[PDB]
Amino acid sequence: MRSSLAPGVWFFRAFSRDSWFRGLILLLTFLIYACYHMSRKPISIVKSRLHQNCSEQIKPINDTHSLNDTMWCSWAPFDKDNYKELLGGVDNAFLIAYAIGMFISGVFGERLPLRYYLSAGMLLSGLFTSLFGLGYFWNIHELWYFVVIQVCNGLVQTTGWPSVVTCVGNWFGKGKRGFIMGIWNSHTSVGNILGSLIAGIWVNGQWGLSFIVPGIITAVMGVITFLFLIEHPEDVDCAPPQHHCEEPAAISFFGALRIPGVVEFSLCLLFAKLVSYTFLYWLPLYIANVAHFSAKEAGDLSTLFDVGGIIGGIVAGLVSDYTNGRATTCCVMLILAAPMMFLYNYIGQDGIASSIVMLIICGGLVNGPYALITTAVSADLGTHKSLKGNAKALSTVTAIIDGTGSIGAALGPLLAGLISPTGWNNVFYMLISADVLACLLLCRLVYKEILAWKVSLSRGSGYK
Amino acid sequence: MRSSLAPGVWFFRAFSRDSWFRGLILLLTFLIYACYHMSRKPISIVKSRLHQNCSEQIKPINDTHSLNDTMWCSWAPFDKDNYKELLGGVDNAFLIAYAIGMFISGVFGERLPLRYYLSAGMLLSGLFTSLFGLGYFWNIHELWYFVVIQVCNGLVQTTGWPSVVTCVGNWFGKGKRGFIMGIWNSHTSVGNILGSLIAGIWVNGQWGLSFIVPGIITAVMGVITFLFLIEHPEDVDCAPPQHHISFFGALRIPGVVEFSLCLLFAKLVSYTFLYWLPLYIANVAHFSAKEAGDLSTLFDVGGIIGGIVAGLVSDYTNGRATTCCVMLILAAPMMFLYNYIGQDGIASSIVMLIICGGLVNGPYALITTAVSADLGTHKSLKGNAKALSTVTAIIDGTGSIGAALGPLLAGLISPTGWNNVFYMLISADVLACLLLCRLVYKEILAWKVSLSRG
Numbered sequence: 005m006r007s008s009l010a011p012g013v014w015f016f017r018a019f020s021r022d023s024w025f026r027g028l029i030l031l032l033t034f035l036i037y038a039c040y041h042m043s044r045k046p047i048s049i050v051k052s053r054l055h056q057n058c059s060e061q062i063k064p065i066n067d068t069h070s071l072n073d074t075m076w077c078s079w080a081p082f083d084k085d086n087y088k089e090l091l092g093g094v095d096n097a098f099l100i101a102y103a104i105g106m107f108i109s110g111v112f113g114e115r116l117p118l119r120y121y122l123s124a125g126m127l128l129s130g131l132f133t134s135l136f137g138l139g140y141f142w143n144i145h146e147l148w149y150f151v152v153i154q155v156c157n158g159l160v161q162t163t164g165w166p167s168v169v170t171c172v173g174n175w176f177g178k179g180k181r182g183f184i185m186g187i188w189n190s191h192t193s194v195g196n197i198l199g200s201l202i203a204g205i206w207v208n209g210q211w212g213l214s215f216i217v218p219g220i221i222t223a224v225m226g227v228i229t230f231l232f233l234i235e236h237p238e239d240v241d242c243a244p245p246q247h248h249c250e251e252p253a254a255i256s257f258f259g260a261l262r263i264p265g266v267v268e269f270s271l272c273l274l275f276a277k278l279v280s281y282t283f284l285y286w287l288p289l290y291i292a293n294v295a296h297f298s299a300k301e302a303g304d305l306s307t308l309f310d311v312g313g314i315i316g317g318i319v320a321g322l323v324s325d326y327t328n329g330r331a332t333t334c335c336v337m338l339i340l341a342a343p344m345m346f347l348y349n350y351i352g353q354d355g356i357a358s359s360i361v362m363l364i365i366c367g368g369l370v371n372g373p374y375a376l377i378t379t380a381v382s383a384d385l386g387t388h389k390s391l392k393g394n395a396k397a398l399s400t401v402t403a404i405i406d407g408t409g410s411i412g413a414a415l416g417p418l419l420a421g422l423i424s425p426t427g428w429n430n431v432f433y434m435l436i437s438a439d440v441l442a443c444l445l446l447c448r449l450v451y452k453e454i455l456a457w458k459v460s461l462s463r464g465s466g467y468k
Numbered sequence: 469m470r471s472s473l474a475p476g477v478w479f480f481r482a483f484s485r486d487s488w489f490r491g492l493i494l495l496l497t498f499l500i501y502a503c504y505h506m507s508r509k510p511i512s513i514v515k516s517r518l519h520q521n522c523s524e525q526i527k528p529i530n531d532t533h534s535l536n537d538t539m540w541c542s543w544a545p546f547d548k549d550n551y552k553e554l555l556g557g558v559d560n561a562f563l564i565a566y567a568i569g570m571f572i573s574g575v576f577g578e579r580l581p582l583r584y585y586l587s588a589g590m591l592l593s594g595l596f597t598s599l600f601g602l603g604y605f606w607n608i609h610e611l612w613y614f615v616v617i618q619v620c621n622g623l624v625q626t627t628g629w630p631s632v633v634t635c636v637g638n639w640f641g642k643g644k645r646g647f648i649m650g651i652w653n654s655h656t657s658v659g660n661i662l663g664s665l666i667a668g669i670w671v672n673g674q675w676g677l678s679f680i681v682p683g684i685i686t687a688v689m690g691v692i693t694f695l696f697l698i699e700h701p702e703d704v705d706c707a708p709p710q711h712h713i714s715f716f717g718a719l720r721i722p723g724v725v726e727f728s729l730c731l732l733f734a735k736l737v738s739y740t741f742l743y744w745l746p747l748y749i750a751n752v753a754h755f756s757a758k759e760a761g762d763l764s765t766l767f768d769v770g771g772i773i774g775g776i777v778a779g780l781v782s783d784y785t786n787g788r789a790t791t792c793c794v795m796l797i798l799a800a801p802m803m804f805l806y807n808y809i810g811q812d813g814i815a816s817s818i819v820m821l822i823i824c825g826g827l828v829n830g831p832y833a834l835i836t837t838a839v840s841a842d843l844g845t846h847k848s849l850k851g852n853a854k855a856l857s858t859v860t861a862i863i864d865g866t867g868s869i870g871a872a873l874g875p876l877l878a879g880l881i882s883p884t885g886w887n888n889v890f891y892m893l894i895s896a897d898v899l900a901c902l903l904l905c906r907l908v909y910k911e912i913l914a915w916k917v918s919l920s921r922g
């Protein structure tokens with residue numbers, strides 16, 4: 005029988021004091037690194053507007069260039085015949101500046117406080133996109149300026165990820181980490197969707213706003229995370245977590261490599277991100293050549309892949325918990341990838357009905373072990389049981405496991421440009437050549453993990 | 469030590485639990501009653517739609533018969549020459565059953581608990597109002613349908629105000645004043661200022677969705693109240709507040725009969741501007757249909773400024789009637805000057821209209837506290853709960869007859885001329901100033917002691 009207390013208040017009463025702060029931090033870390041991606045996005049949207057052919061527009065007065073030169077509807081010095089070399093030389097001066105910047109940000113992230121460092125690593129990321137956006141509103145036509153901004157936009161956005169998993173690893177414990185980090189990784193897709201939808205508004209007109217509006221949203225979130233961030237549970241009298249008297253000093257970069265898993269899970273992720281990039285480079289150069297249906301959907305099937313990543317994580321969390329093996333799940337999910345690329349290649353003769361049901365499963369099998377390794381394996385191998393509690397190593401291990409995975413994407417457009425003139429099918433065999441290297445590199449850790457299972461189950465569970 | 473607390477956490481960890489539980493209710497009651505006011509506004513903003521002149525109108529294919537219609541751009545029981553009289557048989561047919569409803573709910577308002585009676589009053593007042601717009605899609609042309617939906621909408625929507633002041637009056641004292649209450653009383657103006665913007669979108673087009681959208685938002689705020697509202701602080705156990713027939717036949721004491729005929733005028737002034745101003749701007753101003761409705765929202769920022777300034781001044785000057793008499797005696801020179809020009813660009817329809825809104829809706833929210841401040845001090849003391857509630861019921865029951873003579877009277881004075889309405893709104897404003905001399909004569913004697921000791 006219903007009585008005097010309201011249903012919403014009776015539901016919200018039953019949660020304890022800790023389970024509201026530990027849900028607050030799981031919301032703020034969801035907002036911050038989702039506001040990073042809509043800053044990273046818009047140059048992959050305005051890349052078809054800095055050059056286009058001038059054969060379908062109005063002809064107001066400019067009858068000088070023999071009525072057609074394709075030189076006036078193209079804005080920048082990306083105007084002449086090499087609009088694919090110099091325009092492609094911006095996403096190398098961002099990725100080199102971002103994959104070098106991670107191994108120094110992981111060293112800086114230890115010593116300085118994580119509220120005066122995530123704030124000054126988000127205002128500068130709102131400034132160095134807005135200075136790029138102001139190149140249209142000013143009289144700017146060069147080459148070195150547009151790349152010297154996009155280098156300094158790459159040393160700044162590396163303050164996001166190690167500080168975020170340091171702020172999350174300080175609260176949660178040994179328990180449901182995989183199933184909660186897998187649900188929590190939805191920000192990498194929410195940021196992509198809201199970074200395409202904002203920058204798609206002002207792309208067919210004046211293109212300065214697509215870099216200024218995310219550059220203001222990021223700087224506003226930079227002061228909200230200034231005013232409401234609680235890094236430690238000790239400050240608000242909560243309970244310290246359960247990673248199974250005063251502040252530990254530090255750790256140096258030479259000492260963090262002696263943790264036994266930090267090299268294999270580093271080096272596998274370079275190949276996992278390379279697979280997940282070269283597949284997305286292979287898919288537009290497939291459906292527009294063979295299986296000619298849905299030529300306009302190539303800009304859509306690239307993101308319906310990415311949704312398959314999210315369910316690729318959560319299902320790869322529920323298996324990682326109740327087996328207590330993280331290397332023995334990430335290896336199997338990449339064994340199952342190679343019998344699904346070939347079956348999609350075989351089944352693409354049919355239409356959309358196969359090209360969704362295979363694409364979702366492929367996204368579940370190759371963005372799974374990226375998502376599980378980049379946030380849950382990279383936090384318990386940070387606070388390993390070999391540190392004896394007197395070493396603060398969580399913003400430095402994440403830098404290694406992420407700064408390998410960014411080098412893994414910096415070599416993406418290079419190897420996808422130095423084999424792609426040799427046919428167009430030959431880029432696909434590199435994916436199968438890389439999945440075998442992804443699988444066979446975790447062998448030592450799977451060899452350790454299986455003999456731990458053989459003690460507790462095949463013997464008969466003696467002295468548990 | 470090294471990293472201190474955040475400035476938004478160090479600030480929020482200074483407020484007591486009592487302050488958060490008495491802030492939650494001052495937010496929830498605001499968002500309840502603001503959603504009651506926007507169920508009432510779009511019958512005022514759509515009267516500029518039910519009768520268009522078909523002479524000045526684009527005629528593509530809309531001829532069902534030529535030379536004998538002249539009415540195709542009009543709705544059917546509001547198309548004749550009496551379209552300004554039949555709107556007063558609808559808008560008064562609402563405001564009658566809102567008065568007879570509140571005269572009864574002030575007696576039989578205890579047989580159900582507060583939240584089960586408030587959330588069954590935002591759920592049937594969101595149904596009987598979206599039927600008024602759903603009559604468009606079922607396109608019935610009958611005067612009989614636009615009345616029973618309007619007389620039953622008033623009998624439900626009387627469950628708003630008797631069941632908010634006993635939800636606040638338990639938590640934040642048993643009748644309090646101050647600056648936080650001066651902002652809480654702005655809900656009756658915000659519920660009109662956003663009842664015009666939302667319901668003005670679908671006017672030039674299909675006017676069914678000018679009703680069904682607020683009828684959905686009220687019915688959804690009939691669920692958040694059903695799940696989150698707390699009646700008494702005996703349940704969550706916070707700190708209790710600051711503990712501080714024909715009954716004599718229209719009392720011969722110098723209160724009731726010389727005061728009751730003041731709310732009857734000071735509500736008749738403001739409901740004419742609530743139900744006939746977006747037809748004033750639409751008719752004899754710049755000839756819009758939606759912009760004329762949108763310039764009606766600058767009448768309801770005067771209704772905020774005149775609330776805030778009156779609540780600020782009347783506390784620090786030891787008198788509440790002397791901020792009502794002066795602000796009623798000055799609206800009458802200004803409304804006449806507003807009708808004098810009214811058309812010379814959007815310069816004098818912007819700045820004159822706000823200050824005409826600050827001089828008539830400011831003292832709309834104070835002269836009901838003046839009688840409760842003065843008429844607790846009588847030979848019938850505050851211990852007589854059987855009569856101190858009864859005389860306030862008499863005053864507020866005359867106040868609800870003050871609604872039903874505004875839009876009824878405007879709808880009859882309007883077809884005989886349109887300049888005449890701003891003369892009835894002068895003959896009703898100065899008489900509001902005249903019948904507060906009972907309070908002013910006490911106020912002068914109250915200041916005489918401070919002048920003698922000073």
Ligand SMILES: O=P(O)(O)OC[C@H]1O[C@H](O)[C@H](O)[C@@H](O)[C@@H]1O
Binds near residue numbers: 832833836837
């Ligand atoms: O019935 P409404 O027009 O919404 O008025 C609601 C309330 O507004 C103000 O607070 C008045 O001072 C009250 O007397 C009135 O009851």
